[PDB]
């Protein structure tokens, strides 16, 4: 499995973010520590 | 892309009714997690803190999740750790929260697809104040006396206000009693207050001088006219002091004086913000908690209008006081600066294109391009062979029209037609029957300066043409190829009866479309590479086989002093588990005339996709994964990276003539070491099992003869060919097979736009349920995997 | 200014204007003194047709130095040609694929230097081409003109033949004049 | 044993496979390098085997024996208990460690 090209069916993945951007820089008013949470309402393992 | 098994109570994959708490600390920096309120024994640390950090969730079809960011944008189900702030405080008062895809080159709405350019930046929210530097501004002595008056008048502007707010003079200040010891005459004022007022007035004077404004004392008789205000006895406190602020109601300010007042207010705001930042304060959302949280440390534009006026009133009072005394201010015009603009790199412009197999070699074809955002965009036809790293139409591979400047591009630029505006529709027609190309803007033909409708004519067909468009920064467009000609807007007005058919006419399924993405990738150096050349040197009895890299066009008028990123074609994979010889070796010889300070030599993993004009080992992608015990004691710490190299500068510092650097890798232990001229350097790296490392040299050329890979051998160390090719594993003869070739990084590539996309749905559930993201319909694709490149 | 309004709401005045312009242009093409007189007028009076054509941009980077009277006139910018070029979309308007077949036939007949009556007779014989509107290969044109009124009298062979004859004459002569202009 | 079990999704922790029982398990086996070589979920057919009959390789059977009902776990079968010097020709190379994402669907 190192000479012939491989093929395989892969699930498509997507990323999602809120509108929150945090940075660290000298002489900036940004606060360093931050926190958030995610609630998982439903996961269907092995859908495909 | 390497998982590290972390220890937790009730370990299990994320499932329904799971609450994941994520904590970030840019101070260390460190990223840590919690599952259902229970800590996870591990964290990330020592990563690059450049750029902006945002929360993110990656998912495939079949999930529903809810972001909780505190406040009204989500109710936290667990107490944040002490000192950690909810994410909703990172928004500006103007900004409204939303959920968006991380990267996006297209947006579909109700079956209409908009092709997007690139966004220049994001919501930085980093003020980084830079007030005018008045340290070198020297206050003229003759302006001090008037200044000494103004601050005194400023003192009145304080004291009277204390009377107007109900404050009463007392020995000791009391908030409940509205008391303050400072409620006294300027002469009787404490030394600290007078020093503060004098320092503020001197700062203002230096700010005015630094702006270039010229102060002229032209009204000596105005000071006599100026009078105070006879405040009644109710103002005076028990001490016997009654404020006498100067009567400045009659004073009027010019528009230039108003501009000066506004600029002074902005400068004062920036100075105060810098002072607060130095004090440890930080911007907050509608909270002024004394833990160095102030909601006003923002840019002046975003500042509250009331907050602006709070100090603008005092600044205008000072300006009117100055005008009354006769010190007129004359600022200089700002047009003397003569500003300029920058040029957007070709890597940041996004090309969209129809697939080469749809190229047309005959007939008359028509397609439209709607410009949602009027701006820097180009549209036209492209030959198979058009490259994504060259501006559309700057060569002979594309015939385009640019409507922002009203030009036409083919092997150059020529003014043609007229510029467009938002909501315009460009109809592009090609007549391959008689080699003609026509454009229309809103159903009206665009004609050249000579009155001809033919934007282009008399071209060689060769392979054919496909529709192409190029979108700049923040630009949007809609390419309509005619899959439904009734969706055309000006096809019937100009295009239908003239014999032009929609490009995608009599087609059953949508047209495959490609785009250009900026993902740097190593590709083999061609025989026609314009900058570098590679020569193979066979291995003799003493000299091992070599690959000599030299600069084609250095020292001439076409010299390009830019970095070169070279890699070897085949990798050297470490063993899957760690504990005849298991060590591999290769060397690099840098010829005389190549400065060793501009040469980095080592290994790169397959996931190295960095390209920049200036390279530096300090600015490298890295991270450390710490794994702790049940009590948090660290029992492991893994450091990742994608570039294990050494700098020639450090070697020469610890050490004209050619310089030889040898790189050795213990595969059984995954240990990388380096040695310059036999002596072993102290720079050693450790890598995990199953790690593929390609030999790599990154250098800025200073001579025509650059360097050479030497695929030699030494005792207890295999040659590179032996470690790469299993056929020569037993054979100890060094070899350089034709599959082993030198590759260089190229920064842009074509990439196929997927036929279908995940249907993600976002929605604000409520003020306590946060934001919902769901994806339910499954999607898949058949991927082809190139094994060596991983 | 009014071409879009005429196209979206067809009427009889627009068609009559197209017929008049086409007839004048045809007389201009056939006649040889007409073209010479127009050119003489344009050159002698120094009329710049580009003002009346493209008057409705590289100036800062151009220093013109060559000018000749012979370069003041060209068939491309002639108003007689340009008016027909701008009124042609009002004459081809609402042409179904059958009418396009008839127009192609008429242009082919004109290519052999036949009179109007001969072409009208040929269109009268080959009046079965209208069924090309029912072809499957050109089913994509069936609803292009749905928004337009598409309101007309009962089908008449003579009117269709005359309309196709005028359209084909104008198109053929325009193509003939424009071909030499190409390099 | 030669199998290392790493839990993914817990089961009941009480019902374990016994002798003369069919273990209907859905699995996904790949090589130690990340190259998948088998998966019963692609075929839509759970794999059935009986404990104590030596139908399957030793590591797989031991891992399913340790697993409980409705449990999804990762089993690492070393070459000692999964082929070894002689593997499946054309599928599994010699002396290859195997990794199975095994779910114990049913005990019937």
TrEMBL record, chain B:
Domain B30.2/SPRY residues, every copy: 290-486, 532-716
Subcellular location: Sarcoplasmic reticulum membrane
Family the UniProt entry places it in: Belongs to the ryanodine receptor (TC 1.A.3.1) family. RYR3 subfamily.
Protein name from the UniProt record: Ryanodine receptor 3
Species per Swiss-Prot/TrEMBL record: Neovison vison
Range within the parent protein: 723 to 1540 of 4859
């Amino acid at each position: 499995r190192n000479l012939l090209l491989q093929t395989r069916l892969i699930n498509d993945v997507t990323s999602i973010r809120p509108n929150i951007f945090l940075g660290v820089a000298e002489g900036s008013a940004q606060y360093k520590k931050w926190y958030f949470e995610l609630i998982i309402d439903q996961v269907d393992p092995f859908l495909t | 892309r390497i998982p590290r098994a972390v220890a937790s109570i009730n370990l299990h994959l994320l499932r329904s009714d799971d609450v994941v708490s994520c904590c970030l600390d840019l101070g260390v920096p460190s990223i840590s997690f919690r599952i259902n309120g229970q800590p996870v024994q591990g964290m990330f640390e020592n990563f690059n803190t450049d750029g902006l950090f945002f929360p993110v969730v990656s998912f495939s079809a079949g999930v529903k999740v809810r972001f909780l960011t505190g406040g009204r944008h989500g109710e936290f189900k667990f107490l944040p750790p002490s000192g950690y702030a909810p994410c909703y405080e990172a928004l500006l008062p103007k900004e409204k929260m939303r959920l968006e895809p991380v990267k996006e080159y297209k947006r579909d709405a109700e079956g209409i697809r908009d092709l997007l350019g690139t966004t220049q930046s994001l919501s930085q929210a980093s003020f980084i104040p830079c007030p005018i530097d008045t340290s070198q501004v020297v206050l003229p002595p003759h302006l001090e006396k008037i200044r000494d008056r103004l601050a005194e008048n400023i003192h009145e502007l304080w004291g009277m206000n204390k009377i107007e707010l109900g404050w009463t003079f007392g020995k000791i200040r009391d908030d409940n009693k509205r008391q303050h010891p400072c409620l006294v005459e300027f002469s009787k004022l404490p030394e600290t207050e007078k020093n503060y007022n004098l320092q503020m007035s001197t700062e203002t004077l230096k700010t005015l001088l630094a702006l270039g404004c010229h102060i002229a004392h032209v009204n000596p008789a105005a000071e006599e006219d100026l009078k105070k205000v006879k405040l009644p006895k109710n103002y005076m406190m028990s001490n016997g002091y009654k404020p006498a602020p100067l009567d400045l109601s009659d004073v009027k300010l010019l528009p230039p004086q108003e501009v000066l007042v506004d600029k002074l207010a902005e400068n004062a705001h920036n100075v105060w913000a810098k002072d607060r930042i130095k004090q440890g304060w930080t911007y907050g959302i509608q909270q002024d908690l004394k833990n160095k949280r102030n909601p006003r440390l923002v840019p002046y534009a975003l500042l509250d209008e009331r907050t602006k006026k709070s100090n603008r009133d005092s600044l205008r009072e000072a300006v009117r006081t100055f005008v009354g005394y006769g010190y007129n201010i004359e600022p200089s015009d700002q047009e003397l600066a003569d500003p300029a603009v920058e040029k957007v790199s070709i890597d940041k412009i996004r090309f969209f294109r129809v697939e080469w197999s749809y190229a047309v070699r005959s007939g008359k074809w028509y397609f439209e391009f709607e410009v949602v955002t009027g701006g820097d965009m180009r549209v036209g036809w492209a030959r198979p062979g058009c490259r994504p790293d060259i501006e559309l139409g700057a060569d002979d591979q594309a015939f385009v029209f640019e409507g922002s400047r009203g030009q036409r591009w083919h092997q150059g630029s020529g003014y043609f037609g007229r510029t467009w505006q938002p909501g315009d529709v460009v109809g592009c027609m090609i007549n391959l029957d008689d080699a003609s190309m026509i454009f229309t803007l809103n159903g009206e033909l665009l004609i050249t300066n000579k009155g001809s409708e033919l934007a282009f004519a008399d071209y060689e067909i060769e392979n054919g043409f496909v529709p192409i468009c190029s979108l700049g920064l923040s630009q949007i467009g809609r390419m309509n190829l005619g899959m439904d000609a009734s969706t055309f807007k000006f096809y019937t007005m100009c295009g239908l009866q003239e014999g032009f058919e929609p490009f995608a006419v009599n087609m059953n399924r949508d047209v495959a479309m490609w785009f250009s993405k900026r993902l740097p990738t190593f590709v083999n150096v061609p025989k026609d590479h314009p900058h570098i050349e590679v020569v193979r040197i066979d291995g003799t009895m003493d000299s091992p086989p070599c690959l000599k890299v030299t600069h084609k066009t250095f020292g001439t008028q076409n010299s390009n002093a830019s970095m070169i990123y070279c890699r070897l074609s085949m990798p050297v994979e470490c063993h899957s588990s760690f504990s005849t010889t298991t060590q591999c070796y290769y060397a690099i010889r840098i010829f005389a005339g190549q400065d060793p300070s501009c040469v980095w030599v080592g290994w790169v993993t397959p996931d190295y996709h960095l390209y920049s004009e200036k390279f530096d080992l300090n600015k490298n992608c890295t991270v450390t994964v710490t794994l702790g015990d049940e009590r948090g004691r660290v029992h492991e710490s893994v450091k990742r990276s994608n570039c294990y190299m050494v700098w020639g500068g450090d070697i020469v510092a610890t050490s004209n003539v050619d310089l030889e650097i040898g790189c050795l890798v213990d595969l059984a232990m995954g240990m990388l070491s380096f040695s310059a001229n036999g002596r072993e350097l102290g720079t050693c790296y450790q890598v995990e099992p199953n790690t593929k490392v390609f030999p790599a040299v990154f250098l800025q050329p200073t001579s025509t003869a650059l360097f050479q890979f030497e695929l030699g051998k030494l005792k207890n160390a295999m040659p590179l060919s032996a470690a790469i090719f299993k056929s020569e594993e037993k054979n100890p003869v060094p070899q350089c097979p034709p599959r082993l070739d030198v590759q260089t990084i190229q920064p842009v590539l074509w990439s196929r736009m997927p036929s279908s996309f995940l249907k993600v749905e976002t929605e604000r559930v409520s003020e306590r349920h946060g934001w919902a993201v769901q994806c339910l319909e499954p999607l898949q694709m058949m991927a082809l995997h190139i094994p060596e490149e991983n | 200014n009014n071409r879009s309004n005429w196209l979206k709401s067809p009427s009889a005045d627009s068609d009559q204007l197209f017929r008049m312009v086409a007839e004048v242009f045809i007389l201009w093409c056939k006649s040889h003194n007409f073209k010479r007189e127009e050119q003489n007028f344009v050159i002698q009076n120094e009329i710049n047709n580009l003002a009346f054509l493209t008057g409705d941009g590289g100036q800062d980077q151009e220093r013109k130095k060559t000018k000749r009277r012979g370069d003041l006139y060209s068939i491309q910018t002639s108003l007689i040609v340009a008016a027909l070029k701008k009124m042609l979309p009002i004459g081809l308007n609402m042409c179904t694929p059958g009418d396009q077949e008839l127009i192609s036939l008429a242009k082919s007949r004109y290519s052999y230097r036949d009179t109007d009556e001969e072409v009208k007779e040929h269109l009268r014989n080959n009046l079965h081409l209208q069924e090309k509107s029912d072809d499957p290969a050109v089913k994509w044109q069936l609803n292009l003109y749905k928004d337009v009124l598409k309101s007309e009298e009962p089908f008449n062979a003579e009117k269709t033949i005359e309309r196709v004859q005028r359209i084909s004459a104008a198109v053929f002569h325009l193509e003939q004049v424009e071909q030499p202009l190409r390099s | 044993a030669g199998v290392e079990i790493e839990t993914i999704s817990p089961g009941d922790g009480r019902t374990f496979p016994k002798k003369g029982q069919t273990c209907v398990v859905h699995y996904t086996g790949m090589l130690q390098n990340g190259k998948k070589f088998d998966s019963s979920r692609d075929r839509n057919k759970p794999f059935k085997f009986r404990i104590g009959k030596q139908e399957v390789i030793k590591g797989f059977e031991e891992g399913a024996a340790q697993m409980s009902l409705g449990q999804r776990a990762k089993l690492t079968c070393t070459p000692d208990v999964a082929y070894g010097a002689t593997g499946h020709p054309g599928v599994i190379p010699p002396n290859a460690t195997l990794i199975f994402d095994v779910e114990l669907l049913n005990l019937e």
